[PDB]
Ligand binder design. Structure first.
Ligand SMILES: *[C@@H]1O[C@H](CO)[C@@H](O)[C@H](O)[C@H]1NC(C)=O
Ligand SMILES: *[C@@H]1O[C@H](CO)[C@@H](O)[C@H](O)[C@H]1NC(C)=O
Ligand SMILES: *[C@@H]1O[C@H](CO)[C@@H](O)[C@H](O)[C@H]1NC(C)=O
Lengths: 23, 20, 48, 87
């Protein structure tokens, strides 16, 4: 039984706040 | 339409001056 | 007519400038590499 | 101490700047902020859960405006990019 994990599994790499930025 | 010791000196001829 | 031609001509730049931001590509570049130069200059501080 | 150029050392970093009350909303787990070009901008105090903006304290170039010494010796000094309070 296999499924498509479409876009999930993304977690904050660190404890660092950032804003309106592509890191 | 346009857009650590590092400083930006201002231009001598200001934008209002440039327009004149 | 020639006055009218030039007059209507003048208006066209207004639309062309207003429409595409790529009309000012060169000046945008002048900003951009300058922006890039500084950023690259700034980032180097993180290198071992 | 706020609104002063101080030598701060929060949990893991250090630096010199002006600590001011911020208007930013940090997440309950985040600790440090950053600017676009990888620069410390805000810090959560480890003791009070307050968000403080770090502004680097005043500095700039000093340029001497003088007439030629063959004419005078009286000068005038230009403190670049500061206001006339911190000088
Ligand atoms: C640290 O201790 C003080 C005790 O006076 C308390 O008011 C403050 O909220 C504490 N900070 C944290 C993050 O627990
Ligand atoms: C500059 O000073 C010299 C003396 O060292 C003098 O001979 C000359 O006349 C001066 N020039 C002017 C323009 O005053
Ligand atoms: C410093 O000068 C600026 C002018 O850009 C002014 O707006 C500001 O209120 C001044 N602040 C102080 C503390 O002198």
């Amino acid at each position: 039984a296999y499924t498509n994990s479409f876009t999930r599994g993304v977690y904050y790499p660190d404890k660092v706040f950032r804003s309106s930025v592509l890191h | 339409k346009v857009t650590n010791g590092l400083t930006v000196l201002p231009p001598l001829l200001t934008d209002e001056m440039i327009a004149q | 007519l020639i006055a009218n031609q030039f007059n209507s001509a003048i208006g066209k730049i207004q639309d062309s400038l207003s429409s595409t931001a790529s009309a000012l590509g060169k000046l945008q570049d002048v900003v951009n590499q300058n922006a890039q130069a500084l950023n690259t200059l700034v980032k180097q501080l993180s290198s071992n | 101490v706020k609104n002063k150029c101080v030598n701060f050392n929060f949990n893991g970093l250090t630096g010199t700047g002006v600590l001011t009350e911020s208007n930013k909303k940090f997440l309950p787990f985040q600790q440090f902020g950053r600017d676009i070009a990888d620069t410390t901008d805000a810090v959560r105090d480890p003791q009070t859960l307050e968000i403080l903006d770090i502004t680097p304290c005043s500095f700039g170039g000093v340029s001497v405006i003088t007439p030629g010494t063959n004419t005078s010796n009286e000068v005038a000094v230009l403190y670049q990019d500061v206001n006339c309070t911190e000088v």
